[PDB]
């Protein structure tokens, strides 16, 4: 019946600040060690700074110290962390978690606890729904959609509403130079269904309230 | 500053078997602030082992670590398929932490080459003055290959983006999609657009290729 919230995810420009929360129920946090982790897209995870709740006392990552300030609300069982002077550097998502022991002559404490993790992105873009292109199509054939020039992240995308779900493969997003995102989503199927089955991907980007279904249609040279 | 290292990068072993990973601290560090987690996609790390040798509470039992010092190892006597993941060792000094780098444990099965399919840019994008073609390779292992482009024989660089799924639930391969970006000018002024792909289940690269304006 532990659980750490966090609040909702962030877009921010360079250099502006970013404050996330992290909310504890169930448990106090004067008993609790909180930490902040970041991971960045694709990579590893990286310790920034936290709480330790026993000692009332804060602790940074020297690599951060400059710019980032945690908070401890004893009142509200409430963790902040600020982290200013932004770049996409920063860009991750950002995890609470209970990271520190208790060493006492008894054993070694520890929780295990972590939030849901909170995703900020640093970046000039603005946000802007996809288009979505269609990537059209022996015995198996691939089709697919392309939903090129999104921001911010996420986009979801489902075949048939949701009836097609073998042989797809949703890619991870890139992020291009212009600083927006593009995806694309494929399937393999049977190449006698291309003239009988329809094909449509249903593409979702809720930062921009778009929704699109895209029918995609073979080629054929005859 | 502790700095700590992981080994391997990638590990690659089947169900059943036994996997061991490696950390090394760049100085001797309290056993009492070594510890092991587990990452999957999209979720928040997890405690395996805390005290260098603790199993944390609802840990199965093949989770085990030992060492002190330097050097420590996270085992797991006999991988399930939920184990397949990124694990992390941890330390500290201070309540000041730092993560080593990780350790991919995938999935090894059968070697399998990609099947390659290309998708020319379509007519409604070109509307809009840009071009993308896509390369797919699709449902291979193990997770490295090699694509290039060639536009009337021309080697391109540094005008695509790769992406690369996870491997899959059920029959443990990954896919991979490569795009290459254009203008609408240049797509128009030039006639072969060529995807080779390399890998190691292939016995030469395989190429996929269309004349552009070809049905």
């Known amino acids: 019946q532990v659980q750490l919230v966090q609040s909702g995810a962030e877009v921010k420009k360079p250099g502006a600040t970013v404050k996330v929360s992290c909310k504890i129920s169930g448990h106090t946090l004067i ?22 709740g026993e000692v009332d006392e804060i602790f940074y990552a020297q690599k951060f110290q400059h710019r980032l300030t945690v908070i401890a609300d004893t009142a509200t069982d409430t963790v902040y962390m600020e982290l200013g002077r932004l770049t996409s550097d920063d860009t991750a998502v950002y995890f609470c978690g209970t990271l520190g022991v208790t060493v006492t002559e008894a054993g070694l404490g520890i929780d295990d606890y972590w939030g849901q993790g909170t995703l900020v992105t640093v970046s000039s873009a603005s946000t802007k729904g996809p288009s979505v292109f269609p990537l059209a199509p022996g015995g198996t054939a691939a089709l697919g959609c392309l939903v090129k020039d999104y921001f911010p992240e996420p986009v979801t995308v489902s075949w048939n509403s949701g009836a097609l779900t073998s042989g797809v493969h949703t890619f991870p997003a890139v992020l291009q130079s212009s600083g927006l995102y593009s995806l694309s ?16 991907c249903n ?13 995609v249609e073979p080629k054929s040279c005859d | 500053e502790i700095v700590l290292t992981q080994s391997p990068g990638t590990l690659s072993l089947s169900p059943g078997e036994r996997a061991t990973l490696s950390c090394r601290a760049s100085q001797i560090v309290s056993r009492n602030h070594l510890a092991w987690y587990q990452q999957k996609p999209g979720q928040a790390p997890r405690l395996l082992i805390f005290g260098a040798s603790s199993r944390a509470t609802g840990i199965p039992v093949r ?13 797991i006597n006999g991988l399930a398929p939920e184990d397949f993941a990124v694990y992390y060792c941890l330390s500290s000094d201070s309540s000041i932490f730092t993560f080593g780098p990780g350790t991919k444990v995938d999935f090894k ?7 390659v399919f290309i998708f020319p840019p379509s007519d409604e994008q070109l509307k809009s003055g840009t071009a993308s073609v896509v390369c797919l390779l699709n449902n291979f292992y193990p997770r490295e290959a090699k694509v290039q482009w060639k536009v009337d024989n021309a080697l391109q660089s540094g ?17 991979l999609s490569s795009t290459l970006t254009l203008s609408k000018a240049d797509y128009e002024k030039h006639k072969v657009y060529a995807c080779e792909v390399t890998h190691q289940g292939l016995s030469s690269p395989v190429t996929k290729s269309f004349n552009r304006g070809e049905c």
């Open chain 2, 159 to 175: 005008n695509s983006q790769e992406s690369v799924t996870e491997q899959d639930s059920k029959d443990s391969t990954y896919s």
């Open chain 2, 109 to 115: 099965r059968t070697v399998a080459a990609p099947s």
């Open chain 1, 185 to 200: 989503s494929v399937v393999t199927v049977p190449s006698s269904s291309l003239g009988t089955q329809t094909y449509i």
């Open chain 2, 63 to 75: 989770f085990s670590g030992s060492g002190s010092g330097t050097d420590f190892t996270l085992t």
């Open chain 1, 203 to 215: 593409v979702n980007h809720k930062p921009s309230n778009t929704k699109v279904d895209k029918k």
């Open chain 1, 31 to 52: 008993k609790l060690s909180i930490h902040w982790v970041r991971q960045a897209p694709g990579k590893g995870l990286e310790w920034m700074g936290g709480y330790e």
